[model samples]
Target chain A: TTGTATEPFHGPHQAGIATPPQAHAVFLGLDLRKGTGRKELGRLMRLLTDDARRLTQGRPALADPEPDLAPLPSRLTFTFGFGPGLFKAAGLEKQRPEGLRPLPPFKVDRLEDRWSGGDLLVQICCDDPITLAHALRMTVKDARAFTRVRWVQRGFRRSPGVQSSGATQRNLMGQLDGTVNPVPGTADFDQAVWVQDGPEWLRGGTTLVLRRIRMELEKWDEADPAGKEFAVGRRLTSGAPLTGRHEHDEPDFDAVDSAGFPVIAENAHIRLAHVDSPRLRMLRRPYNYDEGLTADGRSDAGLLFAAYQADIDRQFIPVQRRLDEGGDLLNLWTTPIGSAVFAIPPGCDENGWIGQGLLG
Target chain B: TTGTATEPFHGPHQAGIATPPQAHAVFLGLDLRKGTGRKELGRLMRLLTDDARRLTQGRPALADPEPDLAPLPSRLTFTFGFGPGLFKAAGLEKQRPEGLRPLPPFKVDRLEDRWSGGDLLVQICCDDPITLAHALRMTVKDARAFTRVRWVQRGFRRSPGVQSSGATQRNLMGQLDGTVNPVPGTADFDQAVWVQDGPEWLRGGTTLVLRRIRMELEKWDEADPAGKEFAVGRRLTSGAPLTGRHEHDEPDFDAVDSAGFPVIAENAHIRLAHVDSPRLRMLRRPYNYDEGLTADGRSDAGLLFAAYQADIDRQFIPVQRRLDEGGDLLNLWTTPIGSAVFAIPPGCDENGWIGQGLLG
Candidate 1:
């Protein structure tokens, strides 16, 4: 998916080898609906080709209404879209979203919406703190110039890293945070992310859940650190579970304290949410944020929790239910501000546009 | 400087094509000295070989006296200990942050430290921000294990972009912003970067001016936008010069405005900085930040600015003098928090280690 825009330095995929801390700003939720039919999708795909070329070429200066201003390069990504009826009319629809096609059957959860069902989801990142602050304005401007989107909401990361590091995730009080989720392309990743069901075109794609969680840092900090630790079931100091594992290690619920209680309580966030149920396993990609001072002095903050699971109903929802029913400690300092689910269609194979299978 | 760790999918660089913003970080005013002789520099390099190999091979790990919190992968780049005495010692001084040798033509304008004639520079970069953070921490920990360093600081990008993006310059505020910067490998890039005077071994290297300028965002934000624009000699909304031209368009300092004043007025930050000297020409990389809530409940924030240039005495110092003397309006909102100069020797050849040439 990566190639150098110019020469010498390798592209991000090839030479890029670094990352920032729980760098979080704000999370944006986008649900773009399908416009025409199958062929219309292809037309959209064709449009995306132009977008991709420009973006890959390091956002060349394209036409703009205000010639005096720099032609804003839409460094936007064209992740493909696919669904059951998505192939009904064929043609351009098959190639839209940069030739991306619908993914195979997997768990996906839809949010409340009045418009048509959306078949596409996009996550845009940038480092302009000012731009992130005016994300609504920028996104709205892009939506007006691009597609018909269903829902639009801004979510804050739980603990955001300082600086214009983009939509980095953070909790309310701001501790660098995120699930050090499994890497993609691994045997474990492929097994956890993809579904073997549906058409061949969907085989490589994945299902994504975008949730905007607002962290109540002030509230969280107010609670005793012990209770807060129990809420997440992990130590706040090092993100390690009370089971005494390393930061990236898993918790051992079997370990008991002097009182005979599990070192990490059964109802703890990490314990309850991450159960043995394969259906509950999810790959989480999230960011932390600090929204700056409000006019009234309250901190506008939280995390944009985006999770990808094979089956939303079977896997993700159960975890949510468990958290709701269990005395989830994190709940005291957290709230789900927004949510949406999208079906990421698989990419096109070599020499072919995406959806070639679906279009056929 | 990028290479992946573990499975690679854990960071931005690993995802390929999922272009996250270009990550930029720097260490300013660090002082390093060489304790070993020039010939011994090569010997030390050869000695470090087994360490690099075992770590890269992912062996069961060896015990180093200094706590090696796992030799995490890093994009470490070492620059010069700029001086002429090394060749006289029968070996070329390799690029080592603290590796010592002799002195370059010393300049007296800056706040000079006497320890080792302060020269060498090291910079590490990668796409995955998380990995970068980890690698940096590990590198710092390891560095502390290696020597007694004077200062340590870290910085991030002011804007989201792919590394090596061809943007140069910064938005005033003395921010280390990048706009019109060279696209690495292009003729324009080579001419802008790479030093020619050094031996054949250092052809590809360049000099870096690490000036930690603290931005005054609150002060800047409170100013009238027009006044602010006047300071930068550009429209804040469009990022265009006051002459009403596009960002890449050349400046027009002599043009007149509706009020009959020069469009790019004499007092403008751009006019003063660019018209009189070379300061306006260096590359800027800035990171914005707000340092949490103050006791009185107010946002305390700014940016860390870093710029790179060819010759500090010939190019950088003059411009800084003007700003220090309050030569322009932008001075009201900006201050130099930290400043130091270093020579980024060059990228190593296939056979050489990072510090081979600069330290030897």
Candidate 2:
């Protein structure tokens, strides 16, 4: 049940983006120290690449102090990405991928310093929390010498066997999220998620927007079911569109309600998030998060909102702007507490290290 | 695979005490709010009991605001216990069970206030983190009006199907922990873990000692393999006793090495932790924990060390004292950061809520 589920770390693109989502994940943001430069960045990526290759194959890193703590990878994946700061630090500004900079400030954002930015990022995921913790520790230990940790956010999803395969997930607000993902292994997925004409460092790779959206669960709790469904434009029980019969049925936006109004509200999350053009779609791989209770007895829980796409400005920004301006119903419950963007590089073959394109 | 693994919430004894350990657990310690009395305590217990009964049976609590967040139970369990302060707050001091007070301070202790003690404790465990988080939220929400949280600690064990059935778990230090516990369903288990002739309020119940032992993994990494094995008196690879072949083989402490020295060092962890008398046996169900890294680059990782027995003074104290006095090798790598003791009441039937014996 474990070893059989292993995922290969080496591929045309990084594993986590195209790989099926894991039950647990951690995103670490590291800032390059003052003395760190090109050599240090190269050393750090080599160390991380070695650990990621070994850990994802159920093997411990050479420097893993407590190897026994490592679990069967259980489909563990380690995806590496770079922000604009990384290229500046390594003295490779010309090699920086286009659109690998901080996202344009959004009107709905209430971003905090603690989670807003990083020079380099590591996204580690696996089926077990213990495995995720171990892999994160091992990788972080290796990265410590080169960079200072700016922020860390841990998240979890439904356990591997909890739901049927291919079922949509629920956020902390109990709303079905990300039901209309591009099917993996299909041309649509490739067209939406993988870069085919970018520079050598980013071809076949993708961009990731890691936004920490904090759900105001107390306020959400007061929202009635019908009102909540109206906000999302989907049935809470089956996640079907208001104008459709099943989860995947296309919504007939022109359908009218008994009162002669549109069946799906104009400002609904589903409506604002929908894109008529295929090029505007991005793959959403999100995880729910609960970091215990706050001093006021309110839950500090929400979504670790992550979306992968070929081009951030072209695919991600337009939809997000629509949601922000259209008054999506979920806006009342969720606030973007942190935001960062990373340009993921294509994966490397054996004997090659991650970021080799930029390092060379 | 998930709904199929639910555990019954009502029985002769609380479910989590002897039930197989789940993958994830969260322990919440609550202190009664000012002006709260016996009536409030009764109401809190009833609310909690109802929630536990439904949640462990794969259903959401009646007051759950986000019922969609409730996952299949996945072997979910909720166990409640009382500290001496709880009885005092409820004006029922005479009903407090013996050995429910704070443990006598030990020389090896470095207890901190944040994690040390509370008036009440709820132990929730489940095979999935999402399920564990949801159940914890529901239960804590019900108790919030009557109490404030003193502390919260989350821990994890190996996933259900990751290791073979009945396999021993490894701690953060990579040492096999809980290798010598009495097997469940046997006379030894009943004798060691369940109270058969204690006070009426505690009959069929047990006492629990929770010690937060922080492991110095960095310092441990500097120790050579030979020294680590010598300190543990067990093979690091297979967890076998130095004088035995298999993990379960009894160690011959009298056996000598080729140099005529004792094969198992007198200060070894196993030697000091061992109790020759049958009455001293107890079930050790411990979980591994990693709270990320510290400011100085060392891991903030440890074990949520828990031991269950019928009497803490009679069974637990003696063994701990022996280890504390024998120059225990493990003491070099661990510090007791927090400690607490609880009096667990017997479980209730279908119509009976928990704490009935004392509350009535």
Candidate 3:
């Protein structure tokens, strides 16, 4: 039943943000075509919602000639994230969420336009790659008429059965990412990630800050183990804090070494990215991306960093601002190359369409 | 221990040619750096072989700072395929496989330089997507000194546990591929894939023809089911031959409809690609590739067609030539966009490098 596993598409909240990250994901940023306005947007969402709902249940999109490929959803989800451009296109800019706009440039950023900004975002994820491809093709086959493609970023994690779900995933740089996040179903997670009091249309929605951070692995490999660990303020192998014995053990930034320096450096990544207010933390759902190999052999590898929160200003940007300051050592080996923000709308009932509260 | 599963990198024949297709693969085509001749290549191969051997068996490459990623092979493999240019670079062109040169152009060919010929190939594959990327990066990190990147083609298949291994895999076009291929460990497979007698250095080696075939899914999805099946000469749902009831049933080429028309058309894909002599057939291990999406919503997706044989000229070309010359119905929805030929050398023992027989 591995391929047959399906995630419910009809719910009060969209699936991808709260559901466990799948083995594969295809993130597409699409721009609205000129003159594709409010009524057209509603029509497009209805058609797409119908197909997404059907395809997520292991059924084919309507009249899909290649029905053979869709009978295995494999925990598939079709998540829609609305951008500022989408609001502008619908003449509903007045209703746009304050946090759903392009991120402010950071000192650690080397932003490229090719990977940034779109009117809409389609985040498709599945455990089975073939099923994932089919869903993307079928979805794009219909939506192409109203939109133009901007960028497509494919990312992946460990396949199922590679490791237990509880284990933190390792990135290309061999760091244990997502170590400090709240559990998906916990009250803290919901409080931190879902909107409680915002625009009425976005009450159940959340904001996303997607950053493409490239890892300078060639330079990273040049550093010694202790020096590299010092940068992250965690053990490379165990992912334990400098003063802790286990991965989940609380970090003791107060601890000092023989040299009388703080055990966790003032410029360490963990210290700067740490959130003491658990309910105000960001819900990170990141996937690793390794794209091209240069003529010199360095990989164009990075993280497709997806962080969801009730408010980007409250839960996300403060930590990024800290990292952007001169002290965060990881900035030396990582650069944010692409950035975008989106408002992930709540899920709809079987009869309703996504974004209907706004576009309807 | 699914992640711990390892395919033997040390063997009489290369692992990937006969091993079951992995869910993830990164195919790299590299051009040997200028003046990277026989002696330099020997040193490169020895260093590469040692690292590849260690990594494939769940060990770290020498001095690897990120040894954590190498612990799970996930049935990982690093297959090396030599090109004619490699032999030329080594001043050993006389030893090159006669059938290993760039393929002659065909009617359906729209070859692009970006995806074609190379001096060497490092085809890395693994069931775990994360592990696959690590293997590719590690392999290329070392191989880059003597080569410049030519092309990188990433491909995928159904993840493990998605379906039973015996079930034929479906490509992006929704047709079950590899239905009629010979099973590994059988006499016919050994005959068809591994060289029994050739150059002394290549006795246990094989040749490979890697073609990137683009599927026109938009046009394909438009055709009627009957029309689609006629192109394949098989049931779209069952993959059964036109005249047969089950997937593996022999095609009845002479079988005629009530109107005296051939049920399996003369120009059908199965009819043209069929090899009557089982021992003479090629072992096809293909992975589907879905690259970019156009502004108009068309997908750049198709098959990474990797076909292996003891002699490419005798086994692979005839079927391809027939398809090129004639009216293979499936040609309407597919185009051969990229092609490369490689000589897959014999596998190495613990102490030896991959091309030791020739480069030594």
Candidate 4:
């Protein structure tokens, strides 16, 4: 809770609550301008290195050696920027003084921007809702002082308590999330999320996904879980199969009702997800936000669902088609809010910045 | 069918296909050696520039370009070698002579291991798969004349017949792919894949993803399509859903069965794919492969699924958790083989080789 830049921001020392409750959180992003491109980028990064380390460790160590506050343990990284004319065109022009700013304090790496934008995604996460606000303010202050930026936007979501647990994220509506997640130690787990062939730097920690979604919870709660689940497809209760035995068990669509019809139907939300594409596997880490209730006394909620896949096109689309097509039960409760994707360049060696893996 | 590295390659030119696919395709990459680290990387790129124009309609335009066995319309791009330390670490010493040999020309890009290893990727597409092959050979042969380096690979996918009108990619399961993509007309689509807030250099194209998955179709078929459908939450026959009325309709999990059970399971593949997260909106372009037969005469077929999200970790992972934990329907038919995630750097404007976006 210390806003002082000199004071080390402690990791969410207060993250684990004795009891879970409905909650909300927000995430913001800013893209830098070119004039403030390279040189300044280096400085801002170096200045934040200590902060970055402290943040990941839950704000344990202070930049001044003496502890200022507990660290947030959240992650803060700088991805490399590269693409067609991202360089010269975005670079600070000698003739035009104020067009682009100098690069920040971060170290530049040869990061790759294959699928999405070549821009860097600065991310942070925590259990305590207040932890985010504290971190955001500090980051913005430093970014403004050091670099020239192009755009900035923030996103938020609310967790409906009960289902989300232990550093877990919740979608906008109040459903318990991710019942089909891979068990921690099975081959299925590895098959679903790990990429063994990637470099040593990104070994254990797989690629992460972060999205800021705004929610309309008032419209959602009036709907029943059955209706809500239809929008999402899975159960809102145990997150188990609506037609199958358990959450982890496979569903049998062939079993028909006494009416001589297929029980699962041709387009049930649970029917279309193909188990064959493990590359489509991903880990979910979302947050619920219930902070600062609107003046109207209504709730502002949605999910900050994140997906980490090796390939987005192949793995993500097939699953989305089910919901987008509309047979799913949960569609009414969910609506896409603000979204911006950033290729999370792998982490760097001790000497590198966030994008050092690709940039180096 | 000719694999010659000396002819022009184009789309819809062959007899088997009727029209060109809707999605545009192109591949750009480079190779790196200490000898061609930075200075030489640029030189070689310049050299390839001249030949690039000659291949397009500008030069050797042939009426029967296909039967003549020419390479497809492709290009060889160069990016700067990262630096010396990494190069040395990778066993590439600048002072040493003749260290690396040309392995097959891989679709190298900023995604490669080290920047010192010049990055390259060959992009090919057309209604006629034959033209793609021809384009690759011609481009490869053209590359061999100057750069003597080891390692080369093709990174791409064929679009599904259902999604578009052409052969962009096919999952190993033989399903048309990339159908659920967000059309380019929306702001969500633009921000999710392209950097709208940055310099104007990378305007038109988005990023790319590369994953080499080994398919297992024999096992896939053994499991009834009914079983396959539930695992993926999609219909096996036409990729339609078990819930919605049409293939493109959203599924409804809230519907009750004869016994009064919910139609979509809490853990159903389709249920978990709700779009509460923006990351869920990625374009999937996967490829099907049967590398060879197994000892039992079975095929080792699967999908090399690729996801193109603006943010990999944030957007792709959260959605994946639902599928992974849900005991996905797609799992029965496929298994991931050889997995490596790469960041597809942005393509250069018509003017320069790839690096113009970053290093200029």
Candidate 5:
């Protein structure tokens, strides 16, 4: 019954955004085809909604040509989002969520068109690669008539049950990642992630900011452990804050060293990324991506950094600005290569489609 | 203790080849840098040997710069091979295995340069991606001083323990794969997969033929179950031969349908691939690869097809000739996009490096 383990597809919020992250994921960005309009957009939503519902339940999408390829879902999930382009193309620009817009360019950003921007996004996640690939193929195959793919990014986490429950994952750069985050199913999570103040169409939806952050491993590898700890404000072995002793211990940011220097550097990534503001909260769900070697001989590996927030302008933008402007020491070895923002509408029941509010 | 599980890195036969396939794998091809000769080749092998032994045992390679990235091994193994170029570069062409050479061009090949050939091959396999990626990064880092990467291909199967042990895996095409593999400990497997003749350097070693077989899912999807079954000579659901009810039942080539025509098509893949001669036996260990989409909107998915035998010319070549020239129906939907042949030398003791027989 392992593959039969199912996640509910219909709910107040999307399954992939707030439901705990899966072991494998593929994010697809699609552009509406020319001459596609409102009616076509609605049809696409209905088609995809049914496909999502069936796939999450371990069944094939409607008219699945290769039914045998649709194995048990293995906890598969499909969460959809609308980019501004999708709305404008549908002649429904008025209905677009304000939060779904291009992110402001950062000084350190090196965004590439091949990895950024899209009209529609389909985020598929599952515990196994076979299930993920099969579902993605089926969905993309069906969407071909309505949209053209803009980009496709695959990422992964620790395999299910590889680490203990509730364990934070390590990124490709050898650092403990996603240590601090709003706990799902709690009021804190809803406040940080679910769109509370919304136009009718976005009442329960959220905003997603995806950044493809590439790690400069060669230079990073040259840094010594102590130097690395100072830059990250954490111990490499234990993932503990420099002033603390364990992974989860809170850092006393004011603690000073023998020379009255801050134990956790002011320019450290944690110090800059973590600003003390109630509005600066978001749910971080990231996956590490390794696409082998680049043409230049460096490993093309990094984080498919994702953050879900009630409002990106209030939460994500500020944090990213602080990281960039505050000169976070980690910036020396990491670069943001791709960026995108999307409005993920709330989930739907069997009788309704996911983007019904906007589609209608 | 899952991470503590270790496979002997030192043995008469190379690990990973006949080792039951791991859940995840990455195949790396490297080219010797200009000015690199036998000394450089020897040094690279020693470096990789030390890293492989340490990594498979759930330990970091000595001088691993970013040890934090290394996770538990999760049944990791690394198998090494030398392409013909390696033998020539080392000025040891005389020592190259008889079967070590490039594959002859095939009519069904749509080979691409990016996935094609290299001088050295390192196949790293494990149950977890973190382990695979981390070890790969570490090894590539060490090898950077000696060679440049030609290509890197990653692939996966069902996660370890996902299904019942010993169950055959299904490829992206949804075909039951590796069903006819030789049992690892049997004399038949040894005679088929391990060289016993005294080349002195390759006495216990084996020949490897690697093919990147791309699947045409778009066209294949148009095929009905019966058409697919007739083409494969097996049941779509049960993977049984047309004349049989169980997967392992011996396929009857002479089985006839009601019309007195052969139930198994004369051009069936199984009929052609399965020649009657026992000398044609080879161990098939393959991984399914889905690299999203190609530029023209087709699934960039395929099989990292690997065949290990005492001699490729004697075993793999004969079988392949039958499939290619004999018009195996599968060739219509599957294209070999990359091909290479390597000589995997006998494994060594902990203190000995791989390829030591030739290097010494």
Candidate 6:
């Protein structure tokens, strides 16, 4: 049974980024409490690292009040990231990756402070929500002494058995998301995602850019079906490119209809986000979020868009700029309301704690 | 593949009450719009019933904006319910079950208006959250024509295969929450849950008492380990009773300890909530709800306490009264913040729409 499946914790790079996305995830953005310096940060990481080391392997965390909740690990993983504020809090600004900063303002951006910016990030994922919640509680308890609550965004994908193991996921917009993501364990994925050089402490780790995109379901519902497909550059039914019959087939953006308009619109979501070189691509692993209805009965839902790569400036910035400035049709229905960037440090061995290389 | 598994939508009883619990759920409590009388209620029921009929069977909901999402049924089920407000709004208060009114205010109830009362109820569940969210959106879109949302409470259980198929669930407080529940398919369950002599329209259905029980995790964590077990009257590591060896073993409440006190404490959770006759038991199918942390980092998490029974008076009220007045030790850590009661109607056949007997 997959219930007993355990993702390795001691590796060159942390788990969640390279690991297949779990069914449930809760991403926490925490601002370090004022005056917590380098030594305190080191102690915080060590304690939490030990907590996850045990919990991810079906053992109770240290001082785990709810010990019974840990036996069914369900592939739980805790991935920690260092935000700009975290570096500043630790007096280690020089160690922060040069590219680990917030994105430039885009025309479509409508940022909210409640959902944006943090000193640290904890991305917890599990196939089971109970285990996910338990892991989160443990982390929050341990981190409470060192950090202040910033934001918590919970997201989910189709449960493991509900979708075939390798199937691409569908977002709330009913379009195939992550169709072009780098496949883990492949040379292409390694080149595109894991950092091989640049910052010394992050040689095996990557950078992450998380954005909360809100979907305007009412307006999107009123749009014609043809326009819906045109906006995404894919068939609504099978997620196939307008020019291809299969989901994975390369899009022929040049193909034209009898009316002479391009079959795959120039400003379609896929076209605007596409990258040609293997090494320059970002691994997009997104989860759907539905926070329920507004007072007026409108759906407040969309995607927790998570993109990871070796360098955000090269792999992420260019594509986001295109979608922001090129008038991508999807912008009409989706708006990015929250944004953050973090430098994920390399993973440690069994005896070593997370970020030990950098903190030392 | 279990990915395509379907729960029978057409049955004597509604799908959710008896069907195995899905991984995720969102219970929407809606208030009927004014001026929506009997005739208008009929039309609303017909439209929504049809929407659910198609969506539950993996067919696109009528006027479905995101049709692609319907294909992965993931055991999705939409079980509709009628509250007191619905009956009054329809001018059919005379036909309402005599026991359909709200629960009497209990000392433990810190009920908030937003989460308490509703005119109509839509309880949506699916093994896949994506499908669950899509089903909820479809129901909301159609219901918006005749209703205003009062509250939306999302919940979750362990995904299938996380534990053995029939294992009991542990709540956020790390205690077995439903070990004493009447098992579906048992003579006891049928006797306890299916309404046999209620208002003619509700004969084959049941009553659902949904309460939002908030766990005071901070206080719960501070309690001593010995006190935690004493409070629940069970071993925390295994759900075995203080007087028994296995989870399913019957508790011998009369058994005395070496200290000359009852082995299962007089105020233990199980003792206070227990009943003698199988017919008086409530089938507790609860789910966990974690809405993340409060601004101060306290967990806003607890159980979506759902109890299903044939008669609220005979099967539910007595148990709740005992807990509220019996000084159950667990009361120290749990508070009821939301409460609502709904009369679930019998399921319909191939050509029959839900609520056909009553609404027509």
Best by DockQ: 3
Which parts of model 4 have CA positions greater than 4 angstroms off? Answer: A1-26, A58-67, A71-118, A129-131, A146-172, A183-209, A214-219, A222-226, A229-233, A260-262, A272-275, A290-298, A326-329, B1-360
How do the residues A170-254 of candidate 6 rate in per-residue lDDT, one tens digit apiece?
8998888877778999999999998887878889988889999999899999999899999989987777899999988899978
lDDT value, residue B202 of candidate 2: 85
List, in order, the clash count of every candidate structure. Answer: 84, 0, 0, 205, 0, 0
Q: For residues A187-242, could you state the per-residue lDDT of candidate 3 as single tens digits?
A: 99889999998788888878888888899988898988899999999998899999
For the record, the alpha-carbon RMSD of candidate 4 to the native fold, in angstroms, is 31.2
Q: How many clashes in candidate 2?
A: 0
Model 4's alpha-carbon lDDT is 0.40
**Candidate 4, residue A214: lDDT:** 47
Fraction of native contacts (fnat) of each candidate: 0.04, 0.42, 0.82, 0.00, 0.42, 0.75
lDDT at B80, model 2: 94
> Model 3, stretches more than 4 Å misplaced?
none
Report the C-alpha lDDT of model 2 over B93-139, residue by residue, as the tens digit: 88777677888877899999888888888999888877787888887
> How well does each candidate superpose onto the true structure, as a TM-score?
0.46, 0.97, 0.98, 0.37, 0.97, 0.98
Better lDDT candidate (1, 3): 3
**Interface RMSD, candidate 4?**
30.2
lDDT per residue for candidate 6 within B168-213, as digits (tens), equals 8788888876777788878888999999996798889999999999
| Predicted complex 3: CAPRI docking category | medium
Candidates 5 and 6, the one with greater DockQ: 6
Task: Summarize candidate 3's per-residue lDDT along B168-216 as a digit string, tens digits.
Answer: 8888888888898978989999999998876889889898899998898
Interface RMSD of each: 13.5, 2.1, 1.3, 30.2, 2.2, 1.3
> What is each candidate's DockQ, to 2 decimals?
0.03, 0.55, 0.78, 0.01, 0.56, 0.75
The DockQ-based CAPRI class assigned to model 2 is: medium
Give residue A165's error in model 2 in angstroms: 2.6
